[PDB]
Amino acid sequence: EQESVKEFLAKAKEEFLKKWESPSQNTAQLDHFDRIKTLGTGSFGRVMLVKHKETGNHYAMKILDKQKVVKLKQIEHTLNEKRILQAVNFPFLVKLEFSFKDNSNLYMVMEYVPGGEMFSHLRRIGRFSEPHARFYAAQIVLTFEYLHSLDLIYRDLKPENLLIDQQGYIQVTDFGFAKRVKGRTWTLCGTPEYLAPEIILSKGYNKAVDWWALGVLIYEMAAGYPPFFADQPIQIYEKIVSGKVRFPSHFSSDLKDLLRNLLQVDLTKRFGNLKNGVNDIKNHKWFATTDWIAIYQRKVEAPFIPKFKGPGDTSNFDDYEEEEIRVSINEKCGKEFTEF
Numbered sequence: 001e002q003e004s005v006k007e008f009l010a011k012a013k014e015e016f017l018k019k020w021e022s023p024s025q026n027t028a029q030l031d032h033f034d035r036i037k038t039l040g041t042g043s044f045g046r047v048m049l050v051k052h053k054e055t056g057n058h059y060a061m062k063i064l065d066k067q068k069v070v071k072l073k074q075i076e077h078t079l080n081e082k083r084i085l086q087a088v089n090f091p092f093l094v095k096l097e098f099s100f101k102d103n104s105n106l107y108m109v110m111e112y113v114p115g116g117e118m119f120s121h122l123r124r125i126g127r128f129s130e131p132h133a134r135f136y137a138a139q140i141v142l143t144f145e146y147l148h149s150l151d152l153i154y155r156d157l158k159p160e161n162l163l164i165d166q167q168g169y170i171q172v173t174d175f176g177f178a179k180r181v182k183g184r185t186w187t188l189c190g191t192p193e194y195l196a197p198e199i200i201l202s203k204g205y206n207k208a209v210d211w212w213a214l215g216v217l218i219y220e221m222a223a224g225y226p227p228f229f230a231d232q233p234i235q236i237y238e239k240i241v242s243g244k245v246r247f248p249s250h251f252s253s254d255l256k257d258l259l260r261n262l263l264q265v266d267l268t269k270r271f272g273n274l275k276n277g278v279n280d281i282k283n284h285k286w287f288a289t290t291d292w293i294a295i296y297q298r299k300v301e302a303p304f305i306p307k308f309k310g311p312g313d314t315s316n317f318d319d320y321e322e323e324e325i326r327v328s329i330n331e332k333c334g335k336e337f338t339e340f
């Protein structure tokens with residue numbers, strides 16, 4: 001690589017390691033914010049729009065119930081997410097602004113991105129043109145180059161985790177499965193449609209699983225549906241391990257060639273995991289029109305700008321039942337979350 005790229009990544013790792021070894025803790029509290037609206041809900045918690053009472057700034061507050069985080073690997077993942085997010089810095093990653101805990105919950109307060117999830121926009125339009133898909137894919141390539149150079153694996157790439165910001169660019173959210181890994185790792189995690197074969201087969205795996213998931217994401221953006229789907233996960237898994245994929249006729253030859261090399265079932269032959277690393281992807285013909293420095297500097301005009309009215313507009317997110325944020329009189333699971 002060029003010396004400027006090598007020095008950029010060396011400085012990035014220096015800055016990450018300093019925050020990694022001295023994590024920030026306890027930088028706000030709950031009654032510093034007004035609650036506005038629930039933006040999403042899951043098995044362990046929810047994400048809410050909030051407004052800081054002194055500054056008037058809007059944020060996305062993720063709330064995790066400590067008593068639903070029971071398994072050893074669930075606790076490990078919860079601690080991974082906050083330690084990594086407070087240490088990273090890159091143009092296409094959502095920024096963590098505050099974190100804290102109380103008797104019942106863990107809290108991560110992020111910048112609020114009002115344009116909504118890529119998933120919503122993709123399902124509304126049907127599919128993205130190849131130049132449109134390529135604009136988003138280039139941002140993921142640069143983000144994985146950054147994360148992998150810090151010895152981080154992301155492990156949750158899917159359209160629901162890619163938010164579109166006020167300039168039409170991607171902000172990646174949800175680091176719940178992200179982990180710092182020297183060598184291999186073994187946990188079964190991720191959504192079935194995006195899982196690489198070596199996760200399904202219970203092997204020790206590495207950063208190659210993120211490049212497989214990029215292949216799935218690019219296919220889904222350009223086709224409108226993912227390459228492997230079925231009603232039961234076991235059926236999805238059979239398709240993934242088989243080594244077969246059918247491409248729509250409208251795909252360009254260059255797109256098909258890139259996807260065959262990302263959706264390579266043999267991890268030792270998969271693009272992103274060869275001796276030239278990420279540069280086999282950056283130099284592929286499908287990316288020949290991409291100005292990689294212009295993308296990083298956000299100087300390229302985006303395919304579209306989301307419609308919203310201001311920094312507190314919630315019209316690009318959907319409606320959920322509004323439930324209490326109960327905080328018990330007694331502390332729960334204090335020992336497990338001491339480092340949070």
Ligand SMILES: CCN(CC)C[C@@H]1OC[C@@H](N)[C@H]1O
Pocket residue numbers: 042044069074075077078081156174175176177
């Ligand atoms: C932090 C790990 N868990 C909570 C125990 C949450 C999962 O992380 C990835 C994300 N999509 C979510 O479902």
